């Protein structure tokens, strides 16, 4: 029901993958709600939301308003809840507001218990914040995003993933000896690595510039097919 | 002088760029001391530091030991100050220790007054922490590492760069249309962009596997030459 996608490393493509996965789920007839937990709030821009749209659940909670009115509907089977723009002073001092977003966990629990949303994707950052840990606790399933390179290989042996987190590969190049070696090592060593990997496709680099998910921006791209396969796998496995 | 390298986004290539820059500066006859401040602590491995080597300034101060004892002699003109490994509980609870690492700042000022090292490179993370802000203030010059993609272009117009920081482009790919468009836009929308670019070289991907700087790994690669050009520009401009 709850599928939280978190990046082992920054820049692996957590937000674009989350948008593509949400679009693929909504293309299969499932009700989808996307929640951007990233403080930078870059997920809204992938759904044709104006950059000046300051609304967001976190912004409403900090301002004392009701976050439920901050929801944005993309399509009948896809709803969006952007984080909300934060002022420079707030970004410089995250500790002054990190503990003020407690009620969002209760709201997400109520949304899950409602049944109107069959899938509630959460775009999580990597900052070890208390709200992030609470969201991980309320997440039924997790997907840790890694890339086939030395940095992610190093990370996978010292930092602890949340329990139950499958490993997903993104930005997989073609014709790199070190990358092939690391991929084979992960195939024969990493039990939680998913069977699906997403090759480097310029469609993923152009989806954010086009302010659309890669599924809607270009369905015929290889990235779209891989994301749809990942969505079907998630439906099969994470449903219960 | 004191130069601090920080990335506007995770995984842009800040650590590898810092290590290559330190090697390029030391191979030109300048004494360079490089300090690892990111909690991930991945700067050591580029200098043939064993993974089991848990000695680091952060851990040294957390155990009541002397942080100066955690230094390593790599070459006669490069010394390293490893951050040190953190336990899983420490990683998941940064607040319990992130305010106890301030002692390194005044010690770094003392080191700046020592004069032994002509360059003090710092691996500045982007955790928006008090220590990060203090170290950034202590840095005489700041270099912001960005990539030519949608995410970095979005971030540059909604996040604040360090005062006087200059922008360096890493992971400049080949045959990408959106990359060319964004670079042409930045050629006039930004005035802080350096005239040198770092390409997507396999040597930079393999350097971390070989536990060597890219120049030390292979000095004939174009990325190493670009790092050397960056070092020359820093010498000509960031001298004072």
């Amino acid at each position: 029901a709850v599928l939280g996608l978190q990046g082992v490393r920054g820049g692996v493509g957590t937000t674009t993958i989350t948008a593509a996965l949400a679009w693929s789920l909504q293309m299969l007839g499932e009700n989808v709600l996307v929640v951007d937990a990233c403080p930078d709030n870059l997920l809204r821009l992938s759904f044709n939301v104006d950059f000046t749209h300051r609304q967001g659940w976190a912004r409403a909670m900090l301002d004392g308003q009701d976050w439920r009115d901050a929801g944005l509907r993309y399509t009948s089977q896809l709803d969006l809840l952007p984080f909300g723009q934060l002022s420079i002073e707030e970004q410089e001092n995250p500790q002054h507001w990190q503990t003020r977003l407690s009620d969002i966990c209760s709201g997400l629990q109520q949304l899950k218990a409602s049944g109107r949303y069959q899938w509630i994707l959460i775009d999580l950052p990597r900052d070890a914040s208390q709200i992030t840990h609470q969201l991980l606790s309320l997440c039924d399933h997790s997907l840790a995003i890694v890339n086939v390179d030395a940095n992610c290989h190093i990370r996978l042996h010292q930092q602890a993933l949340p329990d139950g987190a499958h490993i997903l590969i993104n930005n997989f190049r073609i014709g790199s000896q070190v990358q092939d070696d690391i991929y084979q090592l992960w195939l024969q060593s990493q039990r939680r690595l998913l069977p699906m990997l997403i090759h480097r496709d310029e469609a993923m680099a152009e989806c954010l510039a086009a302010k659309q998910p890669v599924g809607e921006y270009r369905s015929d791209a290889l990235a779209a097919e891989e994301i749809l396969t990942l969505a079907n796998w998630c439906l099969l496995n994470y449903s219960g | 002088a004191v130069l601090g390298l920080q990335g506007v986004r995770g995984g842009v290539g800040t650590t590898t760029i810092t290590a290559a820059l330190a090697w390029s500066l030391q191979m030109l006859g300048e004494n360079v001391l490089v300090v690892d401040a990111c909690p991930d602590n991945l700067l050591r491995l580029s200098f043939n530091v064993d993974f089991t080597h848990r000695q680091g300034w952060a851990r040294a101060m957390l155990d009541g030991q002397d942080w100066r004892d955690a230094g390593l002699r790599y070459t006669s003109q490069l010394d390293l100050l490893p951050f040190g490994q953190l336990s899983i509980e420490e990683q998941e609870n940064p607040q319990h220790w992130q305010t106890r690492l301030s002692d390194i700042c005044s010690g770094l000022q003392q080191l700046k007054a020592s004069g032994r090292y002509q360059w003090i490179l710092i691996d500045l993370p982007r955790d928006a922490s008090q220590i990060t802000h203090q170290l950034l203030s202590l840095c005489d010059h700041s270099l912001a590492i960005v990539n030519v993609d949608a995410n970095c272009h979005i971030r540059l117009h909604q996040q604040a760069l360090p005062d006087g920081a200059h922008i360096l482009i890493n992971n400049f790919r080949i045959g990408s249309q959106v990359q060319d468009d964004i670079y042409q836009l930045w050629l006039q929308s930004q005035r802080r962009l350096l005239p040198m670019l770092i390409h997507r070289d396999e040597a930079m991907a393999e350097c971390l596997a070989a536990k060597q700087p890219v120049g030390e790994y292979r000095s004939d690669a174009l990325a190493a030459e670009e790092i050397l050009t960056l070092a020359n520009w820093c010498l000509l401009n960031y001298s004072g």
Binding site: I154, H157, I182, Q188, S189 | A209, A210, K211
Partner: peptide, 29 residues
């Protein structure tokens, strides 16, 4: 994490991969 490094050196391609890159060999031990 779930790491099973046992019985890895039994493959020629994996052995070559570990030999070529010291980082992989250091981690796999």
């Amino acid at each position: 994490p779930d790491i099973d490094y046992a019985d890895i050196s039994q493959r020629e391609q994996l052995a070559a991969a570990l030999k070529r890159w010291p980082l992989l060999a250091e981690f796999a031990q």
